[PDB]
């Protein structure tokens, strides 16, 4: 139980402080830390954690601006470009 | 200072009711292998606020009641009586220390059904009145066992004062000597508050074809009654030791027991199918009532034959 | 995970903690730091009335001891 | 071969009778059900964080349609009208004529996306892999008219999604 | 004085919340059985009025008399239930 | 008096809307008059304007919980009029996905049966399993539900590499999931109070009213079309037919739960006995050739062109072909006039006769027992109304 | 005045879109994928979209399946009994424009002939994720509303 609490605190640091921790919590409603698989030209960031169960082992943190639109709060699934769309939906294994 | 005392009872009740809707949705979500609200506010903490505002700015049904005088009276009676049941609760000190507190709550709870009836008449529909008579017939039936079970427990307490239940359980919870009564008491409250598996008004309404702000007020009244039943159940059967110097120690332990009992209605709703209307009537008139009458006989005799008669004071 | 249900339970728990704690605190404030006197029967009311006279300020919860003998 | 699902005779020895009486009076079989829902409360939920997480799909997934090109940029479609012929919903409307260079190409290629059943028969019938159902499924609109695709819309879908469509075709064409 | 003020506050707030929420003769075919449920409730409720004094009745010197009359009343309650039961007053078919 | 049951529950439900006109006396049901047609879409007339391939997707949308089983029935009827035979690997795939589909249907049948009665938690546990089986549908066909995968001649495509291992992984853990479902319902006194001795139907009445499937086997009738009149490779797999003894809702509920266990038993054999080879009849006048052949061979291209425009012609004749669908006997009376479009296509939906028996089965029951009785028949108004 | 109205719309738009209680017409196939959106993988309840509601407590009607001429009057009546604000989501080809039964004598060629539609969700059936995308698209549509700004400028 002590190690469970430690993992919780490592997520705050894993998100570059409390401000970046609260940022993803209110943007994505999730504070998991993953491995940055890559980033596309629009600013979307792609993460993986194969320790998670299938369907949660890959995710994207959407960019805050895309094509002159403010997407800090307004994100949607159509913002993923086709090259990453294949990876995010597990149609392929290779990013 | 007494007005202030009234407010720090009323307002915390309505906030507790608002967030019970969140807790119910999330406890049921996880028992169903999902999450429940977790987007509107961190961990869904703003979901009750979003629902409250949504319901109040929602256009009313424009129903055209048959009695405007009594269309409005029903929700006022439901919510006014629900708040009234809290004033004699010793937590550990009651807002009003009533010598006959148990009778007061038994008497006030007997008036709850008037709101069910008055809404049926105000419905202006044959089917809504029939539904109101089935809810009333179920509620009053399960009031019979609650009154007798309550009396049987008071024969070991010796008073109608709710604080005496705390003294009665200084050395031991009443659940030990009276666990058979505790079981039927708990199920009677589920049936009394029309909760699953006894949620027949919600179910039979979902069948018959024909049968927002006012909905919200009715909802809060029902959920404030659920919390109060479980607080009363903890006081009645799981009495918390009271330290006069550290009174908030009693409140913490008492609150945890109430939450666990309230969370158990949620647990039960997640676990069982729904009774059929005649089947929950057979449950009371042919199972609980014969056993409650026999245990009422037992609990009158038991203190006498053991020389364990409690004092009046 | 299941522990994400606790924040909702904590808020509802604090909401149910305020009434019992508020009544106890206000009683101590209103009764000079003591429990509010309980008078259910005529005897207890008689002594509360007598204490009100004895105190000399019309306050039953002001207690007079051996210093008035 | 058969088996009986409910052909058991209860044992009437006093012990077994008392076992059933305890179940009735003490609700033991109801307590057991409460254990099962309790065990789920402490299990990890199956929910995924949409839209940040997505449901897994395969290269065969039949989503939004697109018209494809050769690597040169020439359109693959030659207005053969096999897709229009096979479409179970009559959702495709095609017209064609000789292009200014004499090429056999369409002047109209419409797909009523509110008639379509997303069955993929058109992409099976196409002899040149011109029409495909792409991987996009997040294209709901606010008006009916936006779901009546013409050739410009479908060609733009091909240019938009070709990077992923080509990869999906590469991963599945040996099963076709 | 305190109880009335508590009662006034509860119902005054209920009216206040209600007004915000709202603005800012023949024979019903309902069965005989449901009538006899209400009448059964009343008669049982009346016999429950008589049992309420029992927690005070147990302090009496005349315990033999009290206990006999306490069980006598509850047994008549049982016999009343037994009679409706055997006269098919509890059946819903 | 006179009531009308609502179109559907307040919670989300997928089986169609019913207009049930009820006669009651007190709590008792005196008459049930089902008014259907609220989902009648003229499927059978539409099929007459389609080629035999174009009509196949109409069958996914009948009992739209048992998609591939409906496809198999239509494919068997067409293959019988064509006088051809699908290849053995296709037959094994069709039985494999027939049993996967039976799991899909029985989960929907049993957990929505509990959900309507108010036992709602098992619904959520078991549609996570249905979600994983939707992934199997989408991996072979690209569609989660309406696959159009089984076709006259075999199956459209071969299993993707790695699919069978995943099906094995799912089947490994599934029996425990059925066990948890039974923990909530089987011995629950409330569930039994809602189901035992409800909607009793005698063996003779069941036959004369045209029942099939579990509606027959719940009354002790020893009939299963997979045993008596086997199709595809069902005569090469071992399984037991569950038989009820009391003919009521509870016995039919147990039959469906046991049928789920037998489906897992059959799936285990299909995974181990899957043979190699082609997936559609090697006969390019019925089944389209491979895309590589279509782009290299003159004969292949011609046959591709004709199969996808005119379609294949079916010799004139009429067949009634039926299978053991998850909901009972699902059949098609298919009439060919020698052309490439069916002349007539009557669909025998097992729920059509079952809902016609609701009035009989509900006599002398309570208003809430009608909920359980429509539940135990497992009605999808897509197949009832066509 | 101008500032308050802007922040006030922000509040009520937040409340209405964060608490979307749906009435689903499970007419046909598409209701199955609708159930899968309520199932644990997507858990529509976590967005505030409750499981069960009742027509007279609902904010959004989801027409999930084929609408026949026989069913058309009953669907319109439910829409007419919904308290406002009310939205309609057309789910799948049948409800969108008739779909695979478009040319049938007994099918309404699109539910938008009977009720006004806010969102059209394509597919036959749309995947549960596609429907969830459409529901979150409707939330964005509500987030764009400006009832008080328009009212204040009348
Ligand atoms: C009386 C108390 C009412 C408090 C207002 C509650 C508003 C909460 C809120 O806006 O959450 C932040 C929200 C959260 O943003 P969101 O709801 O648009 O989206 C969050 C990100 N997703 C959807 C991807 C999960 O911020 C806003 O969107 C601005 C709304 C302002 C409304 C407040 C008016 C005052
Ligand atoms: C149609 C719409 C109607 C809506 C209106 C609201 C509905 C009615 C609300 C419920 C009314 C409850 C009134 C009865 C409660 C009285 C409780 C009581 O017994 O007194 C408590 C308290 C002192 O403690 P006590 O219990 O009297 O000690 C007894 C010693 N053996 O205090 C007292 O004893 C003194 C209190 C006496 C004055 C109470 C007058 C009540 C009038 C109600 C109208
Ligand atoms: C079988 C399924 C059940 C379904 C119904 C739900 C029943 C739920 C029961 C809820 C109550 C559980 C008990 C909660 C314990 C609370 C922990 C606590 O803070 O208090 C500690 C308490 C011991 O202290 P105390 O209660 O004061 O005992 C002295 C005697 N007067 O207690 C020590 O442990
Ligand atoms: C340690 C000392 C003792 C040790 C030895 C044990 C002795 C005590 C045990 C033996 C006492 C006799 C027990 C007999 C009880 C069973 C009687 C019976 O067979 O009738 C039950 C049955 C009820 O069936 P039901 O479906 O509910 O409705 C009618 C359709 N059958 O058919 C009926 O219609 C029953 C109708 C009569 C209902 C009786 C109601 C009981 C009275 C209610 C109060 C309970 C008792 C007092 C309190
Ligand atoms: C030394 C001498 C001493 C003398 C005294 C000795 C006493 C001996 C007697 C001991 C046993 C008494 C048991 C009393 C408990 C009540 C029993 C009961 O009423 O259960 C029977 C009831 C009927 O069920 P059924 O299957 O239909 O039986 C056929 C009836 N014709 O079944 C039901 O109630 C069904 C209830 C369904 C709903 C339950 C759902 C919740 C279950 C978990 C709740 C756990 C309770 C938690 C308690 C919390 C308390 C704070
Ligand atoms: C928890 C307290 C929160 C208090 C917040 C106070 C903010 C007050 C702003 C109220 C804005 C209400 O906005 C408005 O509400 C009513 C019903 O509620 C809706 O309904 C109304 O409009 C429609 C057409 O527009 C009418 O046909 C209908 O008769 C009418 O009821 C409106 O469509 C909506 O635009
Ligand atoms: N979906 C349901 N109808 N049930 C439910 N959980 N309703 C909760 C809705 C509600 C009602 C009043 C208030 I005040 C608040 Cl805060 C929330
Ligand atoms: S997917 Fe099927 S229905 Fe849609 S356009 Fe292609 S052939 Fe026609
Ligand atoms: S898309 Fe393909 S099948 Fe359709 S007309 Fe063009 S080349 Fe022919
Ligand atoms: S759109 Fe497709 S899945 Fe939905 S009801 Fe129509 S045929 Fe069925």
Curated annotation (Swiss-Prot), chain A:
Keyword terms of this UniProt record: Acetylation, Electron transport, Membrane, Mitochondrion, Mitochondrion inner membrane, Respiratory chain, Transport
Disulfide bonds: none
Lipid bilayer topology: Peripheral membrane protein
Keyword Transcription regulation: no
Entry keyword Metal-binding: no
Major localization class: mitochondrion
Localization terms from the record: Mitochondrion inner membrane
GO CC terms, sorted: mitochondrial inner membrane; mitochondrion; respiratory chain complex I
Superkingdom of origin organism: Eukaryota
SUBUNIT field: Complex I is composed of 45 different subunits.
Family per record: Belongs to the complex I NDUFA12 subunit family.
Role played: Accessory subunit of the mitochondrial membrane respiratory chain NADH dehydrogenase (Complex I), that is believed not to be involved in catalysis. Complex I functions in the transfer of electrons from NADH to the respiratory chain. The immediate electron acceptor for the enzyme is believed to be ubiquinone.
Protein name: NADH dehydrogenase [ubiquinone] 1 alpha subcomplex subunit 12
Species this protein is from: Bos taurus (Bovine)
Gene: NDUFA12
Part of the full-length chain shown: 3 to 97 of 145
Curated annotation (Swiss-Prot), chain C:
Record's keyword terms, sorted: Electron transport, Membrane, Mitochondrion, Mitochondrion inner membrane, Respiratory chain, Transmembrane, Transmembrane helix, Transport
A cellular component annotation (GO) from this entry: mitochondrion
Disulfide bonds: none
Primary location group: mitochondrion
InterPro entries given in the database record: NADH_Ub_cplx-1_asu_su-1
Topology of this chain in the membrane: Single-pass membrane protein
Coiled coil regions, renumbered to chain: none
Compartments where located: Mitochondrion inner membrane
Function comment: Accessory subunit of the mitochondrial membrane respiratory chain NADH dehydrogenase (Complex I), that is believed not to be involved in catalysis. Complex I functions in the transfer of electrons from NADH to the respiratory chain. The immediate electron acceptor for the enzyme is believed to be ubiquinone.
Family statement drawn from the similarity comment of this UniProt entry: Belongs to the complex I NDUFA1 subunit family.
Assembly description: Complex I is composed of 45 different subunits.
Record's protein name: NADH dehydrogenase [ubiquinone] 1 alpha subcomplex subunit 1
Species of origin: Bos taurus (Bovine)
Encoding gene, per UniProt annotation: NDUFA1
Swiss-Prot record, chain D:
Localization: Mitochondrion inner membrane
EC number: 7.1.1.2
Top EC class of this enzyme: translocase
Keywords: 4Fe-4S, Electron transport, Iron, Iron-sulfur, Membrane, Metal-binding, Mitochondrion, Mitochondrion inner membrane, NAD, Oxidoreductase, Repeat, Respiratory chain, Transit peptide, Translocase, Transport, Ubiquinone
UniProt-recorded name of the protein: NADH dehydrogenase [ubiquinone] iron-sulfur protein 8, mitochondrial
Role, per record: Core subunit of the mitochondrial membrane respiratory chain NADH dehydrogenase (Complex I) which catalyzes electron transfer from NADH through the respiratory chain, using ubiquinone as an electron acceptor. Essential for the catalytic activity and assembly of complex I.
Key word Cell membrane present: no
Native organism taxonomy: Eukaryota, Metazoa, Chordata, Craniata, Vertebrata
Organism: Bos taurus (Bovine)
Cofactor(s) listed in the protein's UniProt record: [4Fe-4S] cluster
Reactions catalysed: a ubiquinone + NADH + 5 H(+)(in) = a ubiquinol + NAD(+) + 4 H(+)(out)
Binding note for cofactor: Binds 2 [4Fe-4S] clusters per subunit.
Membrane topology, as annotated: Peripheral membrane protein
Swiss-Prot record, chain G:
Any one GO BP annotation for this protein: mitochondrial respiratory chain complex I assembly
Reaction catalysis annotation: a ubiquinone + NADH + 5 H(+)(in) = a ubiquinol + NAD(+) + 4 H(+)(out)
Subcellular localization: Mitochondrion inner membrane
A GO term, aspect molecular function: 4 iron, 4 sulfur cluster binding
Chief location of this protein within or outside the cell: mitochondrion
Modification sites for Hydroxyarginine: 52
Leader peptide range in chain numbering: none
Cofactor names: [4Fe-4S] cluster
Function as written in the Swiss-Prot or TrEMBL entry: Core subunit of the mitochondrial membrane respiratory chain NADH dehydrogenase (Complex I) which catalyzes electron transfer from NADH through the respiratory chain, using ubiquinone as an electron acceptor. Essential for the catalytic activity of complex I.
UniProt name for this protein: NADH dehydrogenase [ubiquinone] iron-sulfur protein 7, mitochondrial
Organism: Bos taurus
Gene (UniProt): NDUFS7
Residues of the full protein shown: 63 to 216 of 216
């Amino acid at each position: 139980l002590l190690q469970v609490l430690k993992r919780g605190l490592q997520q705050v640091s894993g998100h570059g402080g409390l401000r970046g921790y609260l940022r993803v919590l209110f943007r994505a409603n999730d504070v998991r830390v993953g491995t940055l698989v890559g980033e596309d030209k629009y600013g979307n960031k792609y993460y993986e954690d194969n320790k998670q169960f299938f369907g949660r082992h890959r995710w994207v943190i959407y960019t805050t601006e895309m094509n002159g639109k403010n997407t800090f709060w307004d994100v949607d699934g159509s913002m993923v470009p086709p090259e990453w769309h294949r990876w995010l939906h597990c149609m392929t294994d290779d990013p | 200072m007494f007005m202030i005392n009234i407010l720090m009872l009323i307002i915390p009740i309505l906030l507790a009711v608002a967030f019970l809707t969140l807790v119910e949705r999330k406890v049921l979500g996880y028992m169903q292998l999902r999450k429940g609200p977790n987007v509107v506010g961190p961990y869904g903490l703003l979901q009750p606020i979003a629902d409250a505002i949504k319901l109040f700015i929602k256009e009313p049904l424009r129903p055209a009641t048959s009695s405007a005088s009594m269309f409005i009276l029903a929700p006022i009676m439901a919510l006014g009586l629900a708040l009234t049941m809290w004033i004699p609760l010793p937590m550990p000190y009651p807002l009003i220390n009533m010598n006959l507190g148990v009778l007061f709550m038994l008497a006030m709870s007997s008036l709850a059904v008037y709101s069910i009836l008055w809404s049926g008449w105000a419905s202006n529909s044959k089917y809504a009145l029939i539904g109101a008579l089935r809810a009333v017939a179920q509620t009053i039936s399960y009031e019979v066992t609650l009154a007798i079970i309550l009396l049987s427990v008071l024969l070991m307490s010796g008073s109608f004062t709710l604080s005496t239940l705390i003294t009665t359980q200084e050395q031991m919870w009443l659940i030990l000597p009276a666990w058979p009564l505790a079981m039927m008491w708990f199920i009677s409250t589920l049936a009394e508050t029309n909760r699953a598996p006894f949620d027949l008004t919600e179910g039979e309404s979902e069948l018959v074809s024909g049968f927002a702000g006012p909905f919200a007020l009715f909802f809060m009244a029902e959920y404030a009654n659920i919390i109060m039943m479980n607080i009363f159940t903890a006081i009645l059967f799981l009495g918390t030791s009271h330290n006069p110097h550290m009174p908030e120690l009693y409140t913490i332990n008492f609150t945890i027991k109430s939450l666990l009992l309230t969370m158990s209605f949620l647990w039960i709703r997640a676990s069982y199918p729904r009774f059929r209307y005649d089947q929950l009537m057979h449950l009371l008139w042919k199972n609980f009532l014969p056993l409650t009458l026999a245990l009422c006989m037992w609990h009158v005799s038991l203190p006498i034959l053991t020389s364990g008669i409690p004092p009046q004071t | 995970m299941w522990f994400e249900v606790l924040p909702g339970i904590a808020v509802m728990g604090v909401c149910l903690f305020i009434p019992g704690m508020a009544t106890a605190r206000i009683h101590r404030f209103s009764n000079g730091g003591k429990e509010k006197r309980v008078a259910h029967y005529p005897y207890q009311w008689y002594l509360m009335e007598r204490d009100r006279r004895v105190s000399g300020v019309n306050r039953s919860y002001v207690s007079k001891g051996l210093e008035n003998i | 071969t058969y088996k009986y699902v409910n052909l058991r005779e209860p044992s009437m020895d006093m012990k077994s009778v008392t076992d059933r009486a305890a179940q009735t009076l003490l609700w033991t079989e109801l307590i057991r059900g409460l254990g099962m829902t309790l065990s789920y409360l402490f299990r990890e939920p199956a929910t995924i964080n949409y839209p940040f997480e997505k449901g897994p799909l395969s290269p065969r997934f039949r989503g939004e349609h697109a018209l494809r090109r050769y690597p040169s940029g020439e359109e693959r479609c030659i207005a053969c009208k096999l897709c229009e012929a096979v479409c179970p919903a009559q959702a495709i409307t095609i017209e064609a004529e000789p292009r200014a260079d004499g090429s056999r190409r369409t002047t109209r290629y419409d797909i009523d996306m509110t008639k379509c059943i997303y069955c993929g028969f058109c992409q099976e019938a196409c002899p040149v892999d011109a029409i495909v159902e792409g991987p996009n499924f997040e294209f709901s609109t606010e008006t009916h008219e936006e779901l009546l695709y013409n050739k410009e819309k479908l060609l733009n879908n091909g240019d938009k999604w070709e990077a992923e469509i080509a990869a999906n075709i590469q991963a599945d064409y040996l099963y076709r | 004085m305190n109880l009335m003020l508590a009662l006034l506050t509860n119902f005054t707030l209920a009216t206040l919340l209600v007004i915000i929420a709202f603005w800012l003769s023949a024979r019903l075919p309902f069965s005989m059985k449901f009538f006899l449920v209400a009448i059964t409730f009343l008669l049982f409720d009346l016999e429950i009025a008589l049992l309420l004094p029992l927690p005070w009745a147990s302090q009496t010197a005349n315990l033999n008399t009290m206990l006999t009359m306490a069980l006598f009343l509850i047994i008549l309650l049982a016999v009343s239930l037994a009679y409706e039961w055997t006269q098919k007053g509890l059946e819903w078919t | 008096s006179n009531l009308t049951l609502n179109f559907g529950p307040q919670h989300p439900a997928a089986h169609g809307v019913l207009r049930l006109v009820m006669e009651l006396s007190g709590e008792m049901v005196r008459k049930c008059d089902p008014h259907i047609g609220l989902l009648h879409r003229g499927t059978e007339k539409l099929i007459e304007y389609k080629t035999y391939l174009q009509a196949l997707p109409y069958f996914d949308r009948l009992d739209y919980v048992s998609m591939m089983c409906n496809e198999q029935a239509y494919s068997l009827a067409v293959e019988k009029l064509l006088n051809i035979r699908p290849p053995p690997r296709a037959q094994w795939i069709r039985v494999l996905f027939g049993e996967i589909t039976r799991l899909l249907n029985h989960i929907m049948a049993v957990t929505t049966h509990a959900l309507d009665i108010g036992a709602m938690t098992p619904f959520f546990w078991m549609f996570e399993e249905r979600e994983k089986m939707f992934e199997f549908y989408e991996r072979v066909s690209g569609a989660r539900m309406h696959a159009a995968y089984v076709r006259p001649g075999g199956v459209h495509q071969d299993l993707p590499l790695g699919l069978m291992d995943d099906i094995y992984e799912f089947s490994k853990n599934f029996s425990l999931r059925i066990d948890e479902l039974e923990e909530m319902l089987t011995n629950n006194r409330i569930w039994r109070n809602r189901t035992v001795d409800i909607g009793i139907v005698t063996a003779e009445d069941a036959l004369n009213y045209g029942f099939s499937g579990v509606m027959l086997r719940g009354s002790g009738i020893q009939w299963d079309l997979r045993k008596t009149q086997p199709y595809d490779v069902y005569d090469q797999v071992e399984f037991d037919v569950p038989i009820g003894s009391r003919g009521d809702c509870y016995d039919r509920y147990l039959c469906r739960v046991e049928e789920m266990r037998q489906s897992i038993r059959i799936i285990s054999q299909c995974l181990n006995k899957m043979p190699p080879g082609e997936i559609k009849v090697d006969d390019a006048k019925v089944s389209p050739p491979k895309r590589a052949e279509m782009k290299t061979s003159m004969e292949s291209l011609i046959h591709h062109f004709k199969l996808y425009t005119e379609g294949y012609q079916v010799p004139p004749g009429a067949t009634y072909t039926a299978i053991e669908a998850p909901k009972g006997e699902f059949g098609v009376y298919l009439v060919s006039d020698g052309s490439s479009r069916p002349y007539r296509c009557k669909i025998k939906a097992p729920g059509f006769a079952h809902l016609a028996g609701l009035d009989k089965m509900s006599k002398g029951h309570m208003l809430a027992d009608v909920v359980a009785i429509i539940g135990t028949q497992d009605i999808v108004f897509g197949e009832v109304d066509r | 005045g101008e500032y308050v109205v802007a922040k006030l719309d922000d509040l009520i738009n937040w409340a209405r879109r964060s608490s979307l209680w749906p009435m689903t017409f499970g007419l046909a196939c598409c209701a199955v994928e609708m159930m899968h959106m309520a199932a644990p993988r997507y858990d529509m309840d976590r967005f505030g979209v409750v499981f069960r509601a009742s027509p007279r407590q609902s904010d959004v009607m989801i027409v999930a399946g084929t609408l026949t001429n026989k069913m058309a009057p009953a669907l319109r009546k439910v829409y007419d009994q919904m308290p406002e604000p009310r939205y309609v989501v057309s789910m799948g080809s049948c409800a969108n424009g008739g779909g695979y039964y478009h040319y049938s004598y007994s099918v309404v060629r699109g539910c938008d002939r009977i009720v006004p539609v806010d969102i059209y969700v394509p597919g036959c059936p749309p995947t549960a994720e596609a429907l969830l995308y459409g529901i979150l698209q409707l939330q964005k549509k509500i987030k764009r509303e400006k009832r008080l700004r328009i009212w204040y400028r009348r």
